[PDB]
């Protein structure tokens, strides 16, 4: 049968939808991840944790690509994000690659993903996902943007933000380092320095995942010879390069 079509999100007798509050707790049990928005790029960073010392963090992806020019990174539950990134990609393709053809604006896509969060707080047999996403991107219309998607199904633009267990400390860190004008390089230094205080293990560049949605790079597209068309503004930094960056904090 099917008798689970009663929502598993409810209100509490003291107001405040209780289920999404619990789901927001799981983010404070999650890993720390942060995004600093520059005025000529965006940087996102997260820490890799595994349950084994024989585990490969070379086939572990916590920063994932949605479209060349837009990246995402989570804090919270792994499994939840693993399915949710696939649904983000799927709606972006079915509604903006088969209808509007080109890669969406950042603002558009953020709204669309928040609708799926919303539709896991409406129906039975589904309770919501317990991660928060930072979706960094650039469109040529609204410029650089950094957004944060809630487990409530809302979005917020931020100037700089963190999510994870060390989020509260991190936004206090960013207060004094932040400035309305930043370079992309300086952003890298600020981002990794804040995340060093939100990791209580050892802080390597082999176990720290770095990505920029900063400079275009054409040769990562797959072809060259038309410069009006580029390749990905997303660019993941390999490990040895990140090690160079640890020295640049």
């Amino acid at each position: 049968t099917d008798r689970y079509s009663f929502s598993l999100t409810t209100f509490s007798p003291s107001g405040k939808l209780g289920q999404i509050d619990y789901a927001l707790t799981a983010v404070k049990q999650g890993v720390t991840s942060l995004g600093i928005k520059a005025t000529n790029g965006v940087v996102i960073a997260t820490e890799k944790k595994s349950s084994s010392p024989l585990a490969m963090s070379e086939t572990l992806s916590k920063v994932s690509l949605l479209t060349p020019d837009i990246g995402a990174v989570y804090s919270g539950m792994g499994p939840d994000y693993r399915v949710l990134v696939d649904k983000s990609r799927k709606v972006a393709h079915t509604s903006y690659k088969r209808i509007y053809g080109e890669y969406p604006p950042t603002k558009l896509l953020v709204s669309e993903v928040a609708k799926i969060m919303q539709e896991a707080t409406q129906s039975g047999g589904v309770r919501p996902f317990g991660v928060s996403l930072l979706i960094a991107g650039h469109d040529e219309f609204n410029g650089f943007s950094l957004y944060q998607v809630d487990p409530s199904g809302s979005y917020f633009p931020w100037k700089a933000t963190a999510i994870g267990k060390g989020s509260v400390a991190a936004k206090t860190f960013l207060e004094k380092r932040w400035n309305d004008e930043l370079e992309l390089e300086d952003a890298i230094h600020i981002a990794l320095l804040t995340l060093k205080e939100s990791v209580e293990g050892e802080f390597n560049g082999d176990t720290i995942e770095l990505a920029i949605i900063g400079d275009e790079n054409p040769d990562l597209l797959g072809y060259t010879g038309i410069p009006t068309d580029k390749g990905p503004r997303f660019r993941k930094l390999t490990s040895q390069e990140i090690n160079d960056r640890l020295e640049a904090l």
Binding site: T1, D2, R3, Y4, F6, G124
Partner: protein, 236 residues
């Protein structure tokens, strides 16, 4: 989803019916009196708070036809759905069968909406009681019915539903005859007014009067028209 909200109660009742009738008590209050040449449905309008426009506050009396109206007591949210559904059925009769609707037709239709959600599981019925009033075309007899969210209908010749229906009923016992309605429209209007001034209160602010006369005559009377009648009532 089919996990019932309608579940048999140990008294030969259903939880959702009993609750629906509670919601009718707690809600707006409608009085219906029929003359020999009219129906009057008056209902509590909710505008008690100060600085409200009453052209965009919910209609408590809605015309379904050119001579059949629908009034209600109970919740104010559950009721709009039924208004919309009644209109469709009226237009359907007129499309496929012909003949501006009869009041009786619509009385049974509204009760037939109540029965579905009671007897089915996974749904709950509307907490709305209705006064269905009007005329049959080609007949000059006015007709006053009530339906309640149980799905029952009964004819009356005066009726009240909603808050303090006991109070309103007792007033109408001495000043109304079951076998001789009013013979004048103005007296039917004034009798419905006198009942609403018991519970509702506070002038003619929250009073409504809709009048239907035969020949397909619907008029709505604004509150300022009702003031004039009220002063005569007090003087008397």
């Amino acid at each position: 989803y089919d996990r019932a909200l309608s579940i048999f109660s140990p008294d030969g009742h259903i939880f959702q019916v009993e609750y629906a009738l509670e919601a009718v008590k707690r809600g707006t209050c409608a009085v219906g009196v029929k003359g020999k040449n009219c129906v009057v449905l008056g209902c509590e309008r909710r505008s008690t708070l100060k600085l409200q426009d009453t052209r965009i506050t919910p209609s408590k009396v809605s015309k379904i036809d050119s001579h059949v109206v629908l009034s209600f007591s109970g919740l104010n949210a559950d009721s709009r759905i039924l208004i919309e559904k009644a209109r469709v059925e009226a237009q359907s009769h007129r499309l496929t069968l012909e003949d501006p609707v009869t009041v009786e037709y619509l009385t049974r239709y509204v009760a037939g909406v109540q029965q579905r959600y009671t007897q089915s599981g996974g749904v709950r019925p509307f907490g709305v009681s209705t006064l269905i009033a009007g005329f049959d075309p080609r007949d000059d007899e006015p007709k006053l019915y009530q339906t309640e969210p149980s799905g029952i209908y009964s004819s009356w010749s005066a009726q009240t539903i909603g808050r303090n229906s006991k109070t309103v009923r007792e007033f109408l016992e001495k000043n109304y005859d079951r076998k001789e309605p009013p013979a004048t429209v103005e007296e039917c209007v004034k009798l419905t007014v006198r009942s609403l001034l018991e519970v509702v209160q506070t002038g003619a602010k929250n009073i409504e009067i809709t009048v239907v006369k035969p020949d397909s005559d619907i008029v709505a009377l604004s509150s300022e028209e009702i003031n004039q009648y009220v002063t005569q009532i007090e003087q008397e």
